[PDB]
Design an enzyme around this catalytic site. Structure first.
Site, short mmCIF file in Angstrom:
data_model
loop_
_atom_site.label_atom_id
_atom_site.label_comp_id
_atom_site.label_asym_id
_atom_site.label_seq_id
_atom_site.Cartn_x
_atom_site.Cartn_y
_atom_site.Cartn_z
N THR A 162 66.34 62.11 34.73
CA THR A 162 66.93 60.78 34.68
C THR A 162 68.19 60.63 35.53
O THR A 162 68.54 61.52 36.31
CB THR A 162 67.27 60.38 33.22
OG1 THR A 162 68.31 61.24 32.72
CG2 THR A 162 66.03 60.53 32.33
N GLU A 216 63.60 58.78 36.78
CA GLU A 216 63.81 57.49 36.11
C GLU A 216 65.28 57.15 36.24
O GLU A 216 66.10 58.02 36.54
CB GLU A 216 63.53 57.56 34.60
CG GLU A 216 62.17 58.04 34.17
CD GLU A 216 61.98 57.91 32.66
OE1 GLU A 216 62.96 58.09 31.90
OE2 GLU A 216 60.84 57.64 32.23
N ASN A 217 65.63 55.88 36.02
CA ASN A 217 67.02 55.47 36.06
C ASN A 217 67.45 55.53 34.59
O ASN A 217 66.63 55.28 33.70
CB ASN A 217 67.16 54.05 36.62
CG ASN A 217 66.28 53.05 35.91
OD1 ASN A 217 65.05 53.17 35.90
ND2 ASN A 217 66.90 52.03 35.31
N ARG A 257 63.89 48.69 33.01
CA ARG A 257 62.70 48.48 32.20
C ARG A 257 62.10 47.10 32.49
O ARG A 257 62.78 46.21 33.00
CB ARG A 257 63.11 48.58 30.71
CG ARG A 257 61.98 48.54 29.71
CD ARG A 257 62.50 48.52 28.27
NE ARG A 257 63.30 49.69 27.94
CZ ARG A 257 62.80 50.89 27.62
NH1 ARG A 257 61.49 51.08 27.58
NH2 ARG A 257 63.62 51.89 27.34
N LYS A 314 59.98 65.14 29.34
CA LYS A 314 61.23 64.77 29.98
C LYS A 314 62.43 65.62 29.61
O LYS A 314 62.55 66.11 28.49
CB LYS A 314 61.63 63.34 29.63
CG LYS A 314 60.60 62.25 29.81
CD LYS A 314 61.25 60.91 29.39
CE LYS A 314 60.24 59.79 29.36
NZ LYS A 314 60.88 58.50 28.97
N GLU A 370 50.35 56.68 12.53
CA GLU A 370 50.01 57.47 11.36
C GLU A 370 51.02 57.15 10.26
O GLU A 370 51.57 58.04 9.61
CB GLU A 370 50.04 58.96 11.72
CG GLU A 370 49.54 59.92 10.65
CD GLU A 370 49.48 61.37 11.13
OE1 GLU A 370 50.21 61.70 12.09
OE2 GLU A 370 48.72 62.17 10.55
N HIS A 372 58.95 60.56 18.20
CA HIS A 372 60.36 60.47 17.85
C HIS A 372 60.65 59.05 17.37
O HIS A 372 59.82 58.15 17.52
CB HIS A 372 61.25 60.81 19.06
CG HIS A 372 61.11 59.86 20.21
ND1 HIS A 372 60.09 59.95 21.13
CD2 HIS A 372 61.85 58.78 20.57
CE1 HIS A 372 60.20 58.97 22.01
NE2 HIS A 372 61.26 58.25 21.70
N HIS A 431 75.00 64.14 31.92
CA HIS A 431 75.96 64.25 33.01
C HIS A 431 77.45 64.27 32.66
O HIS A 431 78.27 64.61 33.51
CB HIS A 431 75.72 63.11 34.00
CG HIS A 431 75.94 61.76 33.42
ND1 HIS A 431 74.93 61.01 32.86
CD2 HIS A 431 77.08 61.05 33.21
CE1 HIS A 431 75.43 59.91 32.34
NE2 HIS A 431 76.74 59.91 32.54
N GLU A 444 63.00 63.04 24.77
CA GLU A 444 63.52 64.05 25.69
C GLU A 444 63.58 65.43 25.01
O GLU A 444 63.83 65.53 23.80
CB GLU A 444 64.91 63.62 26.17
CG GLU A 444 64.92 62.19 26.70
CD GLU A 444 66.31 61.63 26.94
OE1 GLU A 444 67.16 61.69 26.03
OE2 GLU A 444 66.54 61.10 28.05
N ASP A 501 68.24 50.90 22.52
CA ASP A 501 67.14 50.71 21.58
C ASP A 501 67.20 49.37 20.87
O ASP A 501 68.20 49.00 20.26
CB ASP A 501 67.13 51.85 20.55
CG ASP A 501 66.48 53.12 21.09
OD1 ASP A 501 66.37 53.26 22.33
OD2 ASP A 501 66.08 53.98 20.27
O1 LIG Z 1 74.55 58.59 25.56
C1 LIG Z 1 73.59 57.65 26.04
C2 LIG Z 1 74.07 56.98 27.31
O2 LIG Z 1 75.51 56.99 27.28
C3 LIG Z 1 76.10 56.30 28.39
O3 LIG Z 1 75.67 54.98 28.36
C4 LIG Z 1 75.69 56.96 29.72
O4 LIG Z 1 76.21 56.20 30.81
C5 LIG Z 1 74.16 57.04 29.83
O5 LIG Z 1 73.81 57.81 30.97
C6 LIG Z 1 73.56 57.70 28.57
O6 LIG Z 1 72.12 57.62 28.63
CA LIG Z 2 48.42 64.62 10.38
#
Ligand SMILES: OC[C@H]1O[C@H](O)[C@H](O)[C@@H](O)[C@@H]1O
Ligand SMILES: [Ca+2]
Ligand SMILES: OC[C@H]1O[C@H](O)[C@H](O)[C@@H](O)[C@@H]1O
Length: 516
Positions: free
Chosen positions: A330, A367-368, A397, A287, A56, A89, A292, A172, A97
């Site tokens: 995750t 997911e990892n 991925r 998600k 869009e 997003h 952590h 997320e 990314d």
């Molecule tokens: O902040 C984004 C990323 O930061 C670090 O790479 C962490 O190890 C990872 O778990 C997190 O997704």
């Molecule tokens: Ca619209």
């Protein structure tokens, strides 16, 4: 698995597609062959981001679903299934990314206030996603987007196995509390994201609604605010995280803060179900991020989770069950550290979330967090997935395994398994009054030789005087196992004489009988 159970009979493995569109990586023919190869290795479907910034772009209601349709067409040609993520997003700016797809720039002109974006403790503006506070705009746009997507993808309902929703940054459900520009990147504490004028007044109104008047507020918080304008988010995030969170004010603030996400969850869940339930009839989910770091920091406990919006996971998950949405977590590949300065406890975190999810009866997927380049990580994923009742695992991925034959082979063996029900029968067991018999094996789906938390329980058969049970096993894999007796108190009294094995487990349900 935990609680004497086995792996989830509905377990399925998924492959995350690249961030860039397929035509920017390879051609469609090779893509189709890549999918057939993936299917041969145990992958059930490919999950993919369909960016709002692409669907869009030009303006409100000026849709373009041609890419999503061409992608689906190829998934069909390969005889695979897909799981679209309606990514409302921004792509780009986050860890890992390799894209640049912001949300439509015109959406920002639909409001004159600062209700649409985020502002941190120190003024950093964030526009990766619409502020969940703006429920009127979200209701309009997400509503229109989902319905239009359902209409355009109706011809491909047979290849859509599930639909994932984006609840915030990086897809997320959370606040953008950890970013480079705000100086809160891993492993730093996060900063609260409720400093826009709109956020401040919403909090103020919420407080006043709960207590009636500033007088009742002061009485409840034990404060001496001079006027309603004094009701504000924390002025010092760090001091708040050190001990301010312990006060009545703290509890109210965090309740409101996390509350914004729970309400958002219920809203997108309703919009999604209304738009897809009749047309697709497939499960829907969102998600939760694995924040952590700073988990066990003594100075600022859960210093990264709280600013992200996670203060009470149990309460957070009830919103999911209520909205009829499955959950995806995750960091299933990481292990606990909990040492200065990161104070990282990913595994303890995943264990807590899984436990809560199962209690509430919420379908759990994992997911990892980071790319896996070694067999050892697959083993950890397998341990969590198969012993905590996960219904699915998505690998991030694509390229990591598509261009690495050895790694792909290790994934197929450890995670690309098809669960199959089998009957295990153990005869001549010298059980006494109060004893119970369990089995444990070498693979994760069998508890990896653990007799404390993961053993699989068996059931005595009074008619044939033996112990048996239907256990979920990984089809076409070699396994080794032994039964053992557990006294009424919980101690292992003895083991089966000879180690058993099934090389490999047949894909048709049958039974394995052995003697003590
Ligand atoms: O902040 C984004 C990323 O930061 C670090 O790479 C962490 O190890 C990872 O778990 C997190 O997704
Ligand atoms: Ca619209
Ligand atoms: O591909 C799944 C997710 O991976 C990560 C990206 O930051 C996020 O934008 C994307 O939605």
């Amino acid at each position: 698995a935990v609680n004497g159970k086995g792996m989830n009979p509905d377990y399925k493995a998924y492959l995350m597609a690249p961030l860039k569109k397929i035509p920017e990586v390879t051609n469609w023919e090779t893509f189709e062959n890549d999918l057939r190869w993936a299917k041969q290795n145990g992958f059930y479907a490919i999950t993919v981001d369909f960016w709002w910034g692409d669907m869009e772009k030009n303006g409100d209601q000026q849709f373009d679903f041609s890419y999503a349709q061409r992608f689906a067409q190829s998934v069909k040609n390969a005889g695979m299934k897909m799981i679209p993520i309606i990514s409302t997003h921004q792509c780009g700016g986050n860890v890992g990314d390799d894209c640049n797809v912001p949300i439509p720039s015109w959406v920002w002109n639909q409001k004159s206030d600062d209700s649409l974006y985020f502002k941190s403790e120190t003024g950093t503006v964030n526009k990766e996603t619409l502020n969940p506070l703006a429920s009127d705009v979200i209701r309009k746009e997400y509503g229109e987007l989902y319905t239009a997507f359902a209409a355009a993808m109706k011809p491909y309902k047979d290849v859509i196995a599930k639909i994932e929703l984006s609840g915030g940054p990086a897809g997320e459900l959370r606040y953008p509390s950890y970013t480079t520009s705000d100086g809160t990147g891993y492993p730093s504490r996060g900063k609260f994201q409720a400093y826009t004028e709109f956020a401040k007044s919403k909090f103020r109104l919420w407080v006043l609604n709960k207590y009636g008047s500033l007088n009742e507020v002061n009485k409840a918080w034990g404060t001496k605010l001079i006027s309603e304008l004094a009701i504000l988010p924390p002025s010092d995030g760090e001091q708040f995280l050190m001990n301010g969170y312990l006060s009545m004010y703290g509890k109210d603030y965090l309740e409101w803060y996390q509350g914004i996400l729970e309400n958002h969850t219920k809203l997108i869940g309703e919009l999604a179900h209304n738009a897809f339930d009749t047309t697709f009839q497939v499960p829907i989910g969102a998600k939760i991020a694995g924040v952590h770091w700073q988990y066990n920091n003594p100075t600022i406990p859960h210093g990264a989770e709280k600013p992200a919006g996670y203060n009470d996971y149990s309460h957070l998950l009830d919103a999911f069950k209520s909205a009829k949405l499955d959950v995806t977590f995750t960091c299933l590949e990481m292990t606990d550290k909990g040492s200065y300065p990161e104070y990282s406890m990913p595994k303890t975190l995943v264990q807590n979330i899984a436990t809560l999810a199962n209690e509430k009866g919420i379908v759990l997927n994992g997911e990892n967090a980071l790319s896996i380049g070694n067999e050892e990580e697959y083993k950890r994923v397998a341990e969590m997935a198969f012993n905590y009742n996960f219904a699915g695992f998505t690998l991030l991925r694509y390229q990591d395994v598509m261009y690495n034959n050895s790694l792909m082979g290790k994934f197929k063996d450890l995670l690309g398994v098809t669960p199959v029900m089998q009957t295990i029968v153990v005869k001549n067991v010298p059980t006494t009054i109060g004893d119970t018999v369990y089995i444990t094996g070498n693979r994760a789906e069998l508890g990896s030789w653990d007799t404390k938390q993961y053993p699989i329980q068996l059931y005595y058969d009074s008619h044939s005087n033996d112990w048996r049970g239907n256990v979920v096993l990984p089809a076409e894999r070699n396994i080794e196992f032994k039964a053992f007796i557990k006294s009424k108190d919980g101690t292992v009294k003895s083991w089966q004489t000879i180690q058993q094995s099934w090389n490999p487990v047949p894909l048709k349900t049958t039974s394995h009988t052995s003697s003590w």
